[PDB]
Amino acid sequence: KNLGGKSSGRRQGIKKMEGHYVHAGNIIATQRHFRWHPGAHVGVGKNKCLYALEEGIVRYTKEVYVPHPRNTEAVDLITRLPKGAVLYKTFVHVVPAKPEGTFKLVAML
Amino acid sequence: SKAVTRHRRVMHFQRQKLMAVTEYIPPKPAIHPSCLP
Amino acid sequence: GTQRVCLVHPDVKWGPGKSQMTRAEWQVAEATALVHTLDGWSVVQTMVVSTKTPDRKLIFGKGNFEHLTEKIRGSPDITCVFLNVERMAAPTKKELEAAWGVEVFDRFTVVLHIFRCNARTKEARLQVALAEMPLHRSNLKRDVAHLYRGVGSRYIMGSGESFMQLQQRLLREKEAKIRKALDRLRKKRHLLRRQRTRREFPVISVVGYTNCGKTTLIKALTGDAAIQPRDQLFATLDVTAHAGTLPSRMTVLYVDTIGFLSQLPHGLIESFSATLEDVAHSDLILHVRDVSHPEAELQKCSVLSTLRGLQLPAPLLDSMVEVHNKVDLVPGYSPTEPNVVPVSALRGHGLQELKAELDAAVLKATGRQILTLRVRLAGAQLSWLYKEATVQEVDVIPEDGAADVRVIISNSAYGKFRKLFP
Amino acid sequence: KFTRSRIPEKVFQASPEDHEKYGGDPQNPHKLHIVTRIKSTRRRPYWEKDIIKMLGLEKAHTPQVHKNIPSVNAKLKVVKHLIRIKPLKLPQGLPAEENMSNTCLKSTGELVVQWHLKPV
RNA sequence: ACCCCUAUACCUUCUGCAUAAUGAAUUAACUAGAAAUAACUUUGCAAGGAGAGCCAAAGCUAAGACCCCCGAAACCAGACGAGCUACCUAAGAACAGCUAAAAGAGCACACCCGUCUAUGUAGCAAAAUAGUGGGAAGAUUUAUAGGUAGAGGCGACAAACCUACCGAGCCUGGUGAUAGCUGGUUGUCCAAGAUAGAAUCUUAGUUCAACUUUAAAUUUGCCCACAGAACCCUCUAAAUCCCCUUGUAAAUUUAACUGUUAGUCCAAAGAGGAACAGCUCUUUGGACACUAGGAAAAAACCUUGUAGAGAGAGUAAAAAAUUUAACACCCAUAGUAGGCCUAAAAGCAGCCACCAAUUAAGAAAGCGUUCAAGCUCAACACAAAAAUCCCAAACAUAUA
RNA sequence: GCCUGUUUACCAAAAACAUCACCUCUAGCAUCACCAGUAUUAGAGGCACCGCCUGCCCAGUGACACGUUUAACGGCCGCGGUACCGUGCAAAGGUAGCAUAAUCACUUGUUCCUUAAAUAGGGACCUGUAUGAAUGGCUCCACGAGGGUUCAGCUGUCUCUUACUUUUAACCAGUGAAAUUGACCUGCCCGUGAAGAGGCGGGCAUAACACAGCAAGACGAGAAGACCCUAUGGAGCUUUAAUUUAUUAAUGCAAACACCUGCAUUAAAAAUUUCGGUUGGGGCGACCUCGGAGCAGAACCCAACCUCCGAGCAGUACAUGCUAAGACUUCACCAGUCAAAGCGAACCUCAAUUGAUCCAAUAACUUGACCAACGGAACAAGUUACCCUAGGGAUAACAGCGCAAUCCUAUUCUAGAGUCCAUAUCAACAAUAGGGUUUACGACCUCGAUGUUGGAUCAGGACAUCCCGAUGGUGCAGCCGCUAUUAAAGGUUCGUUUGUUCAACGAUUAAAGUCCUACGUGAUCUGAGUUCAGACCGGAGUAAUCCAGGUCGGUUUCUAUCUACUUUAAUUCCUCCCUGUACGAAAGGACAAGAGAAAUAAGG
Ligand SMILES: Nc1nc2c(ncn2[C@@H]2O[C@H](COP(=O)(O)OP(=O)(O)OP(=O)(O)O)[C@@H](O)[C@H]2O)c(=O)[nH]1
Ligand SMILES: Nc1nc2c(ncn2[C@@H]2O[C@H](COP(=O)(O)OP(=O)(O)OP(=O)(O)O)[C@@H](O)[C@H]2O)c(=O)[nH]1
Ligand SMILES: [Mg+2]
Ligand SMILES: [Mg+2]
Ligand SMILES: [Mg+2]
Ligand SMILES: [Mg+2]
Ligand SMILES: [Mg+2]
Ligand SMILES: [Mg+2]
Ligand SMILES: [Mg+2]
Ligand SMILES: [Mg+2]
Ligand SMILES: [Mg+2]
């Protein structure tokens, strides 16, 4: 009577924990729902996977959640929130390590 | 056998030893109070 | 078990089984009450199907049977089918169960279930096992190919106990053990009555159809508040004796019995054995009829047929006092047939007249003699008579030292008195 | 499921009664542990086996000297049910290069720096 | 010499064998690992090597070194078979006696057959003997010669018979058929070595992973401090991941491979079953498929493991404890037989009131009475049982 | 079954096959069968003498025709009303006959006869929705080593065995095998254990060897189990399984002027090959791929014929374009994911929502399988008991073993039965224990065999006692009883049907016990039942063949090497009397004591 349910695990979750050096483009965490939200220098794919937009150190923090005003469901949740209440979410940041570049003497004209 | 059984499940010998060692020992009041004034 | 029942009532038209006295609506109402009795399930669907050959294996014709099985299989909510056909034969039950995909119950099986589920007696359990012994086609709702070839094939030149041989052996052994246990329980029930018989208590069996008010009548007669009549069918499960006092100051046992049912093998119900043997050994039979019920004639016919089949003594059949209960329900009622006492058990209208009537009946039946006897005072003759015989009246002659006592005394007690105090 | 055991911190907080019983002052703690494997690693988890190998306690009843520092203490806490831990005592102080070849670890836990094998 | 103490043949197979699972009487002899690719080692020559061809961005050339045995029912081709048997062809032979009368007639010999019983069962016999029985002038039996041949013949169809074993003969050959299946696989010694899964006409197998082995290159491998890893869900576990130190010495990568991918119990979290199974299925860990000691014997419990000799020593785990049911003695008047109720129901059949006096007593906490009467209480005083035969012997007291 | 005959040589002799008779179909003809024959003939068949008959149906399939045919395959009903009055449907609604049948089950149908007693037999039935008419139906004369029943007689079949002769046997002499055999210095009990020990643990026993018997064990010898499963192992047979028509026969078209050849089409006959997997053994049923949620609370990953939900799209867009760092990855690979920057532009939603290679279509771009057995053979089903081989105790049936759901037993509870009264005897809801007799469930030993129902024979053991003994209670007046404690020394019947173990019945008994012992015991016996080979009936299927349906028949091996063993104060009934006494109102009716008789068992 019970059919299906044979699907294997997605192997989703965090691929880079805090303090891990991460290169640009590396996937930090794969998730089905928004468990960890994108922080600074972290981009989201179509499937909600978080990838490092810069080369640096991954840091997980708790930050206030301010959704986009056009996110109707979240805006409604906020509108129903009592005064003084602030939503918090777990954000993943990539603290860039190297500088954008250096100025080098190329020609002594 | 499940952890919860309708009968008293047999304990592993080390657990049995642990229970016997950690049995309650009442305080012996030296001289029995019954025959003290 | 929270079952869902389809009540299939074969309405017999023409030929044997055609009921002139009762109607299909009444019979299906009776079946609905029967199934409600068990506290577990209720009728989800009811179908009255015309049938002209009730004696055939399938009861119904080919077209009607196909139509019935069509609905039964189409409707999934049904868990079982109750066939208001008294008793089904084993082949009929097998065919109907296979066709309809669910367990099929008849009146006999349903009553056995009432006894087992309500009166959880060993008699009922053993009777259910006895009736359940025929066991094949375990997986209903589907015909299962089996291919039993090669199981227990000959090893050298012979084979061990095969299937349908082991089944036969188990069937025979189980039947024997159930019968032996039932015999033991019957012997114990007989043992229970030895002291009562020795004390020679006049014993009266109240018999009648279910819900006629046997329990209520016994409550009214005895005055016992512990007796609790109920509106449920087969409420008075198990047989019990209650003491009561008659206007002649006599003590009499009323045997509250299990109510009888129409279209039911009472002799083959083991739980009814106590009732049947108690009415057999009863000194008088009190036939309670609920004249208010529309099916009164059918109920009387069924009860009388059961009593006749019991092969009771001719004097016991005769003098059976008939009491028409529930007379208050009928606004104005007049008993046309003589020698019937109209009473209202709840309202206690004709109870005094009934008491006098069956008091005379007991005096006739038990053989006790009403007589005036002279006893010398201080002899303890008077105390002995007080204990061993009912004492209607006492008149002491102050001068003589004797007393004339009007007493109803049995032959045994009279002989004992004459010998003990010549 | 059977898993690695997390010992609550309160277990390793000595009391004054324990100090009196075992003769160790909370101030000025001992520097080195003498550790002896008194129990087999057989029938014990692979992690305990590995910790024993790391501590170098493969041979039973063979004393080994270890630092009394938090990390070594953590390993010893992991495998504490298989080992006997005692404080290394130096009645004559640390052995010098001159007497490095005359040392002996007495059963009391004292590393005497002179071993004459003669009656006192 | 035996007596003493210790010791559960071997091989194969298996989760696990003394196993009452396989093989083996024993001796002698015979009887079973064939090889490419790519690598590794060692030479030679060297941007070239090689005795045309081929390879080459250190290669090329040469050598060394890894790949078993027996076993089917089968399939097909060509021969050989009808001296047995099935049927037929030619031309022959036999059938006493009695009853009946020109008979697919009866009894009954010879003769043919083989109903039933016994014996026999490596027998006298690879189908018999003794008795018994069916037919015995016919569709009979039978001698001789001939014919029908296997994708076939023949058949009063019993899948009968076709040279003792016909669901389709036998021989030879293809053929050393093939077998994921069973069995076997022969000198010494050391070392490493039991690991998730996926796919599969696939779960008796195989390939890839994982594990394992070898060699080589390199540098981090394991343990692990904070900090850190989600809401749903109100609470919500043992833990885990990550992880510098630290204690350690391993790890990753490169090259070449096999074998294991049919598993048991124990502790723990669970699921199914019946909170059964020495049951089944996952997960963490342990042990076993290796040594030794212990729990009696003992794969899985406990102790302990790295190997030798010793007629030394300290130890590890390691021996079950329980024996259980007494109990008050005295005394009871009472307004009245509290009312109603009932034939009477009077503490004591039912309901309501349920007070009150005597020093002290519930309009009575239980028996009894037809109803009463009579006897008491509160109140005064004073654990287990089964089938061959129980199962070490015994012991309560000499200093842990 | 008409009969005489025939058949599985070597387990079935039969009811099976044939058979006269009847009937169906086909054929208008000669120089090798038919046949040296010619429609009263020949061949292919069905059924089965005879007697009465053989009913209705051509809708479907087949065949023949261009609609016919059932003595071709085959089929031959319902509904509503109260048997007949109407109606639906069909091709026709099973007609005559017979009927518990050799005819699914119910089944030991219900009756009468038969017997003391009958699951047997015979005669009957409002007896079959699974009887039934040349898939032949009834009747019947004869006949049968056919299958049942039976009168009478007969008898050692048996009650109940004994005696003797011969053979065998044992001893002496001559000659002289066979399977078997790891080695054996080869005991019993209990426990253990690979779940049944001569070898292991604890006990007990124990000089040594012969000879003759016995068959409880050596899971004894024997045949690499024929039962069951598995193998991408076979083969036989059937088809309406897949692929073909090479071959024949027809036709049509060519070619040649009917034959021959080539090409097609249709049949007949065949040929080759297959008959998935999982699976609490196999089968049936269900399932096979993908996604979400629990189991799996917290990085990841986790099984289940476990619990639940869903998917095999849809919508919007036409940059839903091109490129490219770095990463993830369903534990392999295949496949699947995310994506910075850049070019070119503007200024995808969705959990699943799918499928490789080859090969086809296309100019190309691209498209193609509910290949769902979803990592996908390009295309193949049944059945086998006529079976075969290789294995498997990896896997079922018997047995053992685990367990105790089921089963059985005992206590606790104090509601309720018991006129009153829980406990004389019981007992609901429940609780706590014990046992290992059942049905299971598990699949641990055994498939290079552990022979497995019932019976005979002999029995060993338990007591949870049926009888005999003692004892307490009783709703124990006596007689019968009921219940409980103790007791296993001894005993525990003969018959009818039935294979029955059992059951019923007949007659008894003091009683006619419940069990265990491989449901004791087949190297002691029997095989009646029982899913080997033959055959019939009913049913299923197109057929082969099949049915835990019936029924008739059907090969019972072993010379003993080892262990073990082979001469170890009795119960009960009845008769009289007590005694018509005690007891009892009567009905009835005892003990104890005493006397006498027997029956069985043991030994002579
Ligand atoms: N009006 C009326 N109703 C009555 C009378 N007697 C009985 N009843 C009703 O019928 C019911 C019968 O219940 P019981 O007296 O227990 O039934 P019984 O006669 O024992 O029958 P079973 O329950 O079948 O045993 C009563 O409970 C009342 O509901 C009567 O005299 N008059
Ligand atoms: N990719 C693909 N290949 C196909 C498909 N259908 C057929 N094929 C190819 O053809 C094979 C199947 O052959 P068939 O079963 O004969 O195909 P069919 O289309 O049913 O019939 P034919 O056209 O007669 O071949 C496949 O294995 C492919 O090679 C399809 O839907 N997709
Ligand atoms: Mg899931
Ligand atoms: Mg078979
Ligand atoms: Mg042996
Ligand atoms: Mg062996
Ligand atoms: Mg084997
Ligand atoms: Mg052998
Ligand atoms: Mg010949
Ligand atoms: Mg003659
Ligand atoms: Mg003749």
Ligand SMILES: [Mg+2]
């Ligand atoms: Mg045949």
Ligand SMILES: [Mg+2]
């Ligand atoms: Mg055959």
Ligand SMILES: [Mg+2]
């Ligand atoms: Mg031959």
Ligand SMILES: [Mg+2]
């Ligand atoms: Mg080979």
Ligand SMILES: [Mg+2]
């Ligand atoms: Mg080694």
Ligand SMILES: [Mg+2]
């Ligand atoms: Mg050592």
Ligand SMILES: [Mg+2]
């Ligand atoms: Mg008192």
Ligand SMILES: [Mg+2]
């Ligand atoms: Mg014949």
Ligand SMILES: [Mg+2]
């Ligand atoms: Mg004949």
Ligand SMILES: [Mg+2]
């Ligand atoms: Mg012949």
Ligand SMILES: [Mg+2]
């Ligand atoms: Mg034969």
Ligand SMILES: [Mg+2]
């Ligand atoms: Mg013959």
Ligand SMILES: [Mg+2]
């Ligand atoms: Mg024969």
Ligand SMILES: [Mg+2]
């Ligand atoms: Mg015939």
Ligand SMILES: [Mg+2]
């Ligand atoms: Mg007979």
Ligand SMILES: [Mg+2]
């Ligand atoms: Mg001789």
